[PDB]
DNA sequence: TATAATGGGAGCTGTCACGGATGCA
DNA sequence: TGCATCCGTGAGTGCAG
């Protein structure tokens, strides 16, 4: 929750924020491939009780060297009005950071 | 043992062959759909490699213990992925093809090596004159 | 110099035919064929097998291949050999080994004849994925089609029947090999559907037109949602060698991560789990931390549910499924002292 | 001749003249190389100086060929290779979408030629056709190994950019010798901007403390439990992940 | 300049659909594909030097 | 409008070109939403 | 470059400087383990995070690249020992 | 699968200097 | 034989891009 403490329910840092290397600005969740848990891995969590979960931190976190005060932030999905963005894309996020 | 030279030298068709694991029959790369490689073509990995390390391509055999079985069903090795870098394949012509820098590195290799002019090798090779091997008798203009 | 003036010279040479040759050429064509069963029941060979070898003889020897489909390779042996049995009938049925040659011989005239006619017709079908002379070709080869389907009894002209198949060559080529990703050729036909309809609806708006836009126009079980996927299979792929910058020192495939091989991270955070469990088996007991060894695998894997279980590790079948319990229970309680292991869930 | 009832013979010859590269591995193929190294050296002996100027760099190509097993008709090809496809991949970007190298489409371009020729062929085309198609085969394999050297450049459409031939990767500034052999770039490395230091010591310099922490990301990772700041290496990662 | 480029090619695609299709039931409409235009001026504006 | 060689077909649309890129005020261009700039250029002029 | 979380290249006049020196180690490792000797890249890296020397390194894996980029110009080089008998820089994953 | 149709289309420009291979008085 | 004349091959580094 920590690193979560800057984040609306939908993922996006709040506009207004203080963000720094590391720091996630926008969660993405992105589907596990053909490695879906292998032995040493399936096992590994059959001692922890949480077994393997199905998606992935994609999310887009802040590179080394930059960071800001997030002033802005542009939604654009598709489903909505107004939009529609090049095939297979259903939404984008635009993170603006002073 | 310790590399110690690097020996360079032409392929012989054969040697050529002798390298290959599959003629690539279909000029396809990759499904359309399932955006596997397409057999027989450019990617596909009873050819070439497996793709994933240790899998074959359809599911039947799945890890290391099975090491160098090609499977029934679909017909790809058990091994590292790292081969689909290291494994060539062939294309089988049917009329033979000259190596272009053994044609136009002037003065050309196989001109010289054969008093064939610069602008002969041409006309024969794209197809601008013929070039006889036993005229069987023939003649022309008054001169065999 | 030029690989295209060079042919359109060749074929420069052939003359044109006048109505009589072509229904001379056309005529001896479609006898020789009749000629070749004919040829066929009485020595009861194969038309095709019959065929190849009127073919070999007519070119001469300079070509002959075994040609797929034939049962027997067709080497210079077996076309003296056959064309001996040929040659062996009486004048009333050898008759016919006659009609047969005279017609490859002008199957040839025929094709090469009418080769200024293809020309005129892959012109045209440029830009679109395929070089003139591979354009050229695939006509061509339709072109062989049109001789051996034609029917001069109809009185047709030939460039009337064989305007046919040219274009039905050229076409499916277009539509079989343009695309560095090869797309069933009647996917191609429909994806050609969507561009020209929303070339017409973009015309009709003054704007481009959206999916749905689309979908409707494209009429019953088009939506939205399958125009969008549709296009995104029609989309081509793009070079590794594309140019980034004005200067040419940069390579598109040069800013492209290599996902697939194990970075030194993970190489290395891999082998020190596959260790530090078995830093967890030799801990408390071997031939339990052995048999949940085999419920799974150190490689390879080895789990299915009851039935190999049921084989060979000593005990009963619910036996190891117990100390397949306390074989993790111990490693639960095990790993609340050496908690080297939460880390690695990520 | 069935109207006429003659039997006509046409004065012509049962000549063999090829075209090609079928040709040229025929002579090749028929090369006793020490026949010819006989004769080059029994007219190394000419005066005129150009003859026997030129019975040497002839020479020189044969006694190559003797002294190293080639034969010489190797210069042709009957099995033309084909490269790894790892080192000439199709891949998908971001997007979903696809990149390919330019070989991909070199081959393909072959492939497609090679085919309708092992067809032509079998469906027995006139020579005119035929020839037009071996042609078009050897054009096909001049692009794929040294595209531009020979004609016109293959270029896909839409655009006036040669492909890449296996040549041009080997070869120039930016070919493989120059670009990835006798220079890489390399790992544990960086960059700034210079600030001149005047306390330093001859022997020293100014490193910025984040630099320092990656350049030796492994070592302070290791040190960082030969400590304790951190139970292992893997958590000790995480630390320095997020500032 | 680019702009004299598309409409030349845009008249390489009229005039092949003049001499091929039905030489009476034809329109401006239907007789111009504008986007070899469309793309000539893209052209110009996101890849030129 | 269209016309034919032969007969004195008339038809006359308005035919849709597409979109040509407008000029700011202060002389430039947006395109896909990045603003450019057009250099003039240089070169040898039409001539003998 | 930075935003790809780039190297920096070491180019033919920065060999040349190491060349000079007579730095062989050194140069070496910008050749091999920092750059694209597979294994001896993530055979380091595990080394350092558990404070063991640095392996010494195999072939670089941009010179086998070189190999089969020859062989598909129908061109054969072998590395060989010095009794000239091939060695197999792809330890017997391209032989059959 | 059948009126008849029968040889392309775009060049691109303002470098240079050396070395080699070829043509020609 | 000696000398035009054409064809092919080169034309700095790293970084931002
Ligand atoms: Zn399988």
Same mark, same amino acid.
């Given at each position: 929750?920590?690193?979560?403490?800057?984040?609306?329910?939908?993922?996006?840092?709040?506009?207004?924020?203080?963000?720094?290397?590391?720091?996630?600005?926008?969660?993405?969740?992105?589907? #596990?491939?053909?490695?879906?848990?292998?032995?040493?891995?399936?096992?590994?969590?059959?001692?922890?009780?949480? !077994?393997?979960?199905?998606?992935?931190?994609?999310?887009?976190?802040?590179?080394?060297?930059?960071?800001?005060?997030?002033?802005?932030?542009?939604?654009?999905?598709?489903?909505?009005?107004?939009?529609?963005?090049?095939?297979?894309?259903?939404?984008?996020?635009? @993170?603006?950071?002073? | 043992?310790? /590399?110690?030279?690097?020996?360079?030298?032409?392929?012989?068709?054969?040697?050529?062959?002798?390298?290959?694991?599959?003629?690539?029959?279909?000029?396809?790369?990759?499904?359309?759909?399932?955006?596997?490689?397409?057999?027989?073509?450019?990617?596909?990995?009873?050819?070439?490699?497996?793709?994933?390390?240790?899998?074959?391509?359809?599911?039947?055999?799945?890890?290391?213990?099975?090491?160098?079985?090609?499977?029934?069903?679909?017909?790809?090795?058990?091994?590292?992925?790292?081969?689909?870098?290291?494994?060539?394949?062939?294309?089988?012509?049917?009329?033979?093809?000259?190596?272009?820098?053994?044609? #136009?590195?002037?003065?050309?290799?196989?001109?010289?090596?054969?008093?064939? =002019?610069?602008?002969?090798?041409?006309?024969?090779?794209?197809?601008?004159?013929?070039?006889?091997?036993?005229?069987?008798?023939?003649?022309?203009?008054?001169?065999? | 110099?030029?690989?295209?003036?060079?042919?359109?010279?060749?074929?420069?040479?052939?003359?044109?035919?006048?109505?009589?040759?072509? /229904?001379?050429?056309?005529?001896? @064509?479609?006898?020789?064929?009749?000629?070749?069963?004919?040829?066929?029941?009485?020595?009861?060979?194969?038309?095709?097998?019959?065929?190849?070898?009127?073919?070999?003889?007519?070119?001469?020897?300079?070509?002959?291949?075994?040609?797929?489909?034939?049962?027997?390779?067709?080497?210079?042996?077996?076309?003296?050999?056959?064309?001996?049995?040929?040659?062996?009938?009486?004048?009333?049925?050898?008759?016919?080994?006659?009609?047969?040659?005279?017609?490859?011989?002008?199957?040839?005239?025929?094709?090469?004849?009418?080769?200024?006619?293809?020309?005129?017709?892959?012109?045209?079908?440029?830009?679109?994925?395929?070089?003139?002379?591979?354009?050229?070709?695939?006509?061509?080869?339709?072109?062989?089609?049109?001789?051996?389907?034609?029917?001069? #009894?109809?009185?047709?002209?030939?460039?009337?029947?064989?305007?046919?198949?040219?274009?039905?060559?050229?076409?499916?080529?277009?539509?079989?090999?343009?695309?560095?990703?090869?797309?069933?050729?009647?996917?191609?036909?429909?994806?050609?559907?969507?561009?020209?309809?929303?070339?017409?609806?973009?015309?009709?708006?003054?704007?481009?037109?959206?999916?749905?836009?689309?979908?409707?126009?494209?009429?019953?079980?088009?939506?939205?949602?399958?125009?969008?996927?549709?296009?995104?299979?029609?989309?081509?792929?793009?070079?590794?060698?594309?140019?980034?910058?004005?200067?040419?020192?940069?390579?598109?495939?040069?800013?492209?991560?290599?996902?697939?091989?194990?970075?030194?991270?993970?190489?290395?955070?891999?082998?020190?789990?596959?260790?530090?469990?078995?830093?967890?088996? =030799?801990?408390?007991?071997?031939?339990?931390?052995?048999?949940?060894?085999?419920?799974?695998?150190?490689?390879?894997?080895?789990?299915?549910?009851?039935?190999?279980?049921?084989?060979?590790?000593?005990?009963?079948?619910?036996?190891?499924?117990?100390?397949?319990?306390?074989?993790?229970?111990?490693?639960?309680?095990?790993?609340?002292?050496?908690?080297?292991?939460?880390?690695?869930?990520? | 001749?069935?109207?006429?009832?003659?039997?006509?013979?046409?004065?012509?010859?049962?000549?063999?003249?090829?075209?090609?590269?079928?040709?040229?591995?025929?002579?090749?193929?028929?090369?006793?190389?020490?026949?010819?190294?006989?004769?080059?050296?029994?007219?190394?002996?000419?005066?005129?100086?150009?003859?026997?100027?030129?019975?040497?760099?002839?020479?020189?190509?044969?006694?190559?060929?003797?002294? =190293?097993?080639?034969?010489?008709?190797?210069?042709?090809?009957?099995?033309?290779? /084909?490269?790894?496809?790892?080192?000439?991949?199709?891949?998908?970007?971001?997007?979903?979408?696809?990149?390919?190298?330019?070989?991909?489409?070199?081959?393909?371009?072959?492939?497609?030629?090679?085919?309708?020729?092992?067809?032509?062929?079998?469906?027995?085309?006139?020579?005119?056709?035929?020839?037009?198609?071996?042609?078009?085969?050897?054009?096909?394999?001049?692009?794929?190994?040294?595209?531009?050297?020979?004609?016109?450049?293959?270029?896909?459409?839409?655009?006036?950019?040669?492909?890449?031939?296996?040549?041009?990767?080997?070869?120039?500034?930016?070919?493989?010798?120059?670009?990835?052999?006798?220079? !890489?770039?390399?790992?544990?490395?960086?960059?700034?901007?210079?600030?001149?230091?005047?306390?330093?010591?001859?022997?020293?310099?100014?490193?910025?403390?984040?630099?320092?922490?990656?350049?030796?990301?492994?070592?302070?990772?290791?040190?960082?439990?030969?400590?304790?700041?951190?139970?292992?290496?893997?958590?000790?990662?995480?630390?320095?992940?997020?500032? | 300049?680019?702009?004299?480029?598309?409409?030349?090619?845009?008249?390489?695609?009229?005039?092949?659909?003049?001499?091929?299709?039905?030489?009476?039931?034809?329109?401006?409409?239907?007789? @111009?594909?504008?986007?070899?235009?469309?793309?000539?001026?893209?052209?110009?504006?996101?890849?030129?030097? | 409008?269209?016309?034919?060689?032969?007969?004195?077909?008339?038809?006359?649309?308005?035919?849709?070109?597409?979109?040509?890129?407008?000029?700011?005020?202060?002389?430039?261009?947006?395109?896909?939403?990045?603003?450019? /700039?057009?250099?003039?250029?240089?070169?040898?002029?039409?001539?003998? | 470059?930075?935003?790809?979380?780039?190297?920096?290249?070491?180019?033919?006049?920065?060999?040349?400087?190491?060349?000079?020196?007579?730095?062989?180690?050194?140069?070496?490792?910008?050749?091999?383990?920092?750059?694209?000797?597979?294994?001896?890249?993530?055979?380091?890296?595990?080394?350092?995070?558990?404070?063991?020397?640095?392996?010494?390194?195999?072939?670089?894996?941009?010179?086998?690249?070189?190999?089969?980029?020859?062989?598909?110009?129908?061109?054969?080089?072998?590395?060989?020992?010095?009794?000239?008998?091939?060695?197999?820089?792809?330890?017997?994953?391209?032989?059959?």
């Amino acid at each position: 929750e920590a690193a979560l403490r800057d984040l609306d329910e939908e993922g996006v840092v709040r506009i207004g924020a203080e963000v720094k290397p590391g720091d996630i600005l926008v969660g993405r969740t992105s589907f #596990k491939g053909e490695s879906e848990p292998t032995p040493e891995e399936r096992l590994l969590r059959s001692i922890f009780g949480e !077994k393997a979960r199905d998606v992935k931190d994609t999310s887009l976190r802040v590179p080394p060297g930059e960071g800001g005060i997030v002033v802005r932030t542009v939604r654009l999905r598709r489903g909505d009005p107004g939009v529609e963005l090049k095939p297979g894309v259903r939404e984008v996020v635009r @993170v603006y950071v002073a | 043992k310790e /590399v110690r030279k690097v020996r360079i030298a032409l392929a012989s068709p054969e040697k050529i062959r002798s390298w290959s694991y599959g003629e690539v029959e279909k000029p396809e790369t990759i499904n359309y759909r399932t955006l596997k490689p397409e057999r027989d073509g450019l990617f596909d990995e009873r050819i070439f490699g497996p793709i994933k390390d240790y899998e074959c391509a359809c599911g039947k055999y799945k890890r290391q213990r099975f090491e160098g079985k090609v499977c029934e069903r679909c017909g790809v090795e058990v091994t590292k992925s790292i081969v689909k870098r290291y494994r060539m394949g062939h294309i089988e012509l049917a009329t033979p093809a000259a190596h272009i820098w053994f044609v #136009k590195d002037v003065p050309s290799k196989i001109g010289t090596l054969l008093d064939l =002019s610069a602008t002969e090798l041409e006309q024969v090779l794209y197809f601008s004159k013929y070039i006889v091997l036993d005229p069987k008798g023939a003649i022309l203009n008054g001169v065999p | 110099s030029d690989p295209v003036r060079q042919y359109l010279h060749e074929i420069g040479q052939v003359p044109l035919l006048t109505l009589e040759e072509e /229904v001379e050429l056309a005529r001896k @064509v479609e006898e020789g064929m009749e000629a070749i069963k004919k040829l066929s029941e009485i020595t009861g060979l194969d038309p095709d097998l019959i065929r190849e070898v009127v073919r070999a003889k007519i070119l001469g020897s300079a070509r002959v291949r075994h040609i797929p489909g034939l049962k027997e390779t067709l080497d210079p042996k077996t076309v003296e050999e056959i064309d001996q049995k040929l040659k062996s009938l009486p004048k009333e049925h050898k008759r016919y080994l006659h009609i047969a040659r005279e017609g490859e011989a002008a199957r040839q005239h025929l094709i090469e004849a009418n080769l200024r006619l293809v020309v005129s017709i892959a012109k045209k079908y440029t830009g679109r994925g395929l070089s003139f002379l591979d354009l050229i070709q695939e006509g061509n080869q339709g072109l062989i089609r049109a001789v051996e389907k034609f029917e001069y #009894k109809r009185r047709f002209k030939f460039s009337t029947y064989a305007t046919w198949w040219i274009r039905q060559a050229i076409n499916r080529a277009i539509a079989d090999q343009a695309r560095t990703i090869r797309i069933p050729v009647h996917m191609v036909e429909t994806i050609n559907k969507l561009s020209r309809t929303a070339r017409q609806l973009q015309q009709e708006l003054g704007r481009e037109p959206t999916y749905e836009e689309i979908a409707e126009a494209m009429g019953p079980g088009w939506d939205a949602k399958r125009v969008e996927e549709t296009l995104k299979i029609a989309q081509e792929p793009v070079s590794l060698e594309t140019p980034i910058g004005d200067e040419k020192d940069s390579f598109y495939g040069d800013f492209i991560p290599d996902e697939h091989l194990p970075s030194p991270v993970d190489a290395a955070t891999q082998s020190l789990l596959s260790e530090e469990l078995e830093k967890a088996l =030799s801990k408390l007991s071997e031939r339990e931390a052995m048999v949940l060894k085999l419920r799974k695998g150190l490689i390879d894997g080895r789990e299915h549910t009851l039935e190999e279980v049921g084989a060979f590790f000593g005990v009963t079948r619910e036996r190891i499924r117990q100390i397949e319990n306390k074989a993790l229970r111990k490693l639960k309680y095990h790993e609340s002292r050496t908690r080297k292991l939460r880390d690695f869930l990520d | 001749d069935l109207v006429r009832n003659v039997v006509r013979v046409v004065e012509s010859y049962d000549i063999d003249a090829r075209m090609g590269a079928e040709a040229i591995q025929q002579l090749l193929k028929e090369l006793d190389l020490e026949a010819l190294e006989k004769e080059l050296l029994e007219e190394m002996k000419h005066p005129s100086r150009a003859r026997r100027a030129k019975a040497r760099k002839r020479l020189e190509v044969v006694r190559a060929f003797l002294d =190293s097993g080639n034969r010489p008709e190797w210069m042709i090809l009957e099995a033309v290779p /084909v490269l790894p496809p790892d080192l000439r991949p199709m891949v998908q970007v971001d997007g979903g979408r696809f990149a390919t190298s330019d070989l991909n489409d070199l081959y393909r371009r072959l492939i497609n030629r090679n085919n309708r020729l092992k067809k032509l062929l079998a469906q027995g085309a006139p020579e005119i056709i035929i020839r037009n198609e071996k042609r078009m085969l050897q054009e096909a394999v001049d692009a794929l190994l040294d595209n531009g050297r020979r004609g016109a450049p293959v270029t896909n459409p839409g655009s006036d950019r040669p492909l890449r031939s296996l040549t041009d990767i080997l070869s120039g500034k930016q070919g493989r010798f120059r670009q990835n052999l006798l220079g !890489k770039r390399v790992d544990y490395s960086g960059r700034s901007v210079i600030v001149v230091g005047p306390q330093l010591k001859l022997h020293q310099c100014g490193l910025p403390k984040r630099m320092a922490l990656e350049l030796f990301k492994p070592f302070l990772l290791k040190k960082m439990e030969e400590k304790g700041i951190a139970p292992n290496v893997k958590a000790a990662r995480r630390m320095l992940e997020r500032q | 300049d680019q702009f004299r480029v598309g409409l030349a090619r845009l008249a390489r695609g009229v005039r092949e659909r003049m001499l091929m299709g039905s030489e009476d039931s034809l329109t401006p409409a239907k007789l @111009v594909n504008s986007r070899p235009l469309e793309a000539a001026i893209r052209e110009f504006f996101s890849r030129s030097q | 409008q269209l016309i034919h060689k032969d007969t004195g077909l008339i038809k006359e649309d308005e035919v849709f070109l597409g979109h040509i890129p407008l000029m700011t005020e202060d002389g430039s261009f947006i395109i896909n939403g990045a603003d450019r /700039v057009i250099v003039s250029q240089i070169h040898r002029s039409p001539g003998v | 470059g930075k935003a790809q979380f780039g190297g920096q290249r070491f180019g033919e006049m920065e060999v040349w400087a190491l060349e000079a020196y007579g730095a062989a180690h050194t140069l070496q490792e910008m050749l091999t383990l920092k750059s694209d000797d597979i294994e001896g890249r993530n055979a380091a890296y595990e080394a350092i995070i558990k404070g063991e020397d640095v392996p010494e390194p195999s072939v670089p894996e941009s010179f086998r690249v070189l190999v089969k980029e020859l062989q598909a110009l129908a061109l054969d080089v072998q590395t060989l020992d010095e009794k000239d008998n091939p060695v197999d820089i792809f330890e017997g994953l391209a032989s059959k």
